[PDB]
């Protein structure tokens, strides 16, 4: 069949680093996140649910990697993560 995808150009000439990580949260959910780090920009594409996947943008914090989108906050610390919004604890795997 068919499939069409829209792409956004990331600003700057900095090197782009992409990585997919699988998680499992305390509510049974299991999904995969895509991390994109390029210069001042750092994003996380997260499926906050089965029919909704959001492009989160990295926001300032003291510790960990905090990302924001919609009414959600995806905050990672090492292999761990927490999804706040309607926090849920998730682990890499």
């Amino acid at each position: 069949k068919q499939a069409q995808v829209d792409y956004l150009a990331l600003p700057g000439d900095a090197k782009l680093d992409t990585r997919s990580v699988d998680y499992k949260c305390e509510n049974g959910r299991k999904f995969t996140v895509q991390y994109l780090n390029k210069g001042d920009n750092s994003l996380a594409v997260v499926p906050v649910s089965d029919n909704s996947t959001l492009v989160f943008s990295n926001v300032i914090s003291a510790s960990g990697a905090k990302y924001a989108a919609g009414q959600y906050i995806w905050w990672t610390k090492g292999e761990e993560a927490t999804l706040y919004g309607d926090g849920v604890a998730c682990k890499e795997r």
């Binding site: 780090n37 750092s42 990295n58 914090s61 003291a62 990672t76 090492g78």
Partner: protein, 129 residues
């Protein structure tokens, strides 16, 4: 160096963290406990390419420079290596700026998930500051 709980509370109190920006002492000892477990040499890599350093796990994308993190802002204008001393001065000072800049203690993931809304005062009890 791994600070003792009360040992850490006394050091933080000398720096003036008690009620610093409205945050009672227990909040700072609590954040350290869950961020680093009182270990001044703790480091942790994150999904954005940054690393957290020190007893208060200061982030290398926003606050310190570790020379290997993309899009570094270095807002505390300090090399991350300077945040790994057995003396918490460098950390306390950057922490004061982080909270002083309105970021609040909410800026620390461990504080948000383990200290916020709890009996933080308990973390300085029995210590005889």
């Amino acid at each position: 160096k791994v600070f003792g709980r009360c040992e850490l509370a006394a050091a933080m109190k000398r720096h003036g963290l008690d009620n610093y920006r409205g945050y009672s002492l227990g909040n700072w000892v609590c954040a350290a406990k869950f961020e680093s477990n009182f270990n001044t040499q703790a480091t942790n890599r994150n999904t954005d390419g940054s690393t957290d350093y020190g007893i208060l796990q200061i982030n290398s994308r926003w606050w310190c420079n570790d020379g290997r993190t993309p899009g570094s802002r270095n807002l505390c204008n300090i090399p991350c290596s300077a945040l790994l001393s057995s003396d918490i001065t460098a950390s306390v000072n950057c922490a004061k700026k982080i909270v002083s800049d309105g970021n609040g203690m909410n800026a620390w993931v461990a504080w948000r998930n383990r200290c916020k809304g709890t009996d933080v005062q308990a973390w300085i009890r029995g210590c005889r500051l």
